[PDB]
Design a protein around this ligand. Sequence first.
Ligand code: BEF
Ligand SMILES: [Mn+2]
Length: 128
Amino acid sequence: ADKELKFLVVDDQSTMRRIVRNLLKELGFNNVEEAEDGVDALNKLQAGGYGFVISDWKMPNMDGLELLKTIRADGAMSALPVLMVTAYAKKENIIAAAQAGASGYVVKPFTAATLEEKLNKIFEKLGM
Ligand code: BEF
Ligand SMILES: [Mn+2]
């Protein structure tokens, strides 16, 4: 994928945002911004230019399933890649996120290799 691809990393825990941002840097992606919940995310997205969203689920103000649904329903951003990265591991959560249009889903805790693999799977699916 294009190394200038602009990522938005959304998680309500600063530790997890730092993990994901650092992993992206190792993969050669430095154009990375952060958000703390779905509302903060949407504000950043409105500003434009984003090419990929990595999102937590459990967050105050707007949770990540609502964020994913909002993105998918909005004409300006309906095709934005959204990778869910969450501690929710139950199949009903996986099903609800998949049905809502998630591009992929990673369960926390996750290894660097898992994040790379799942990002690549999405790049290949979308021809990026
Ligand atoms: F708080 Be997240 F869904 F891991
Ligand atoms: Mn959370």
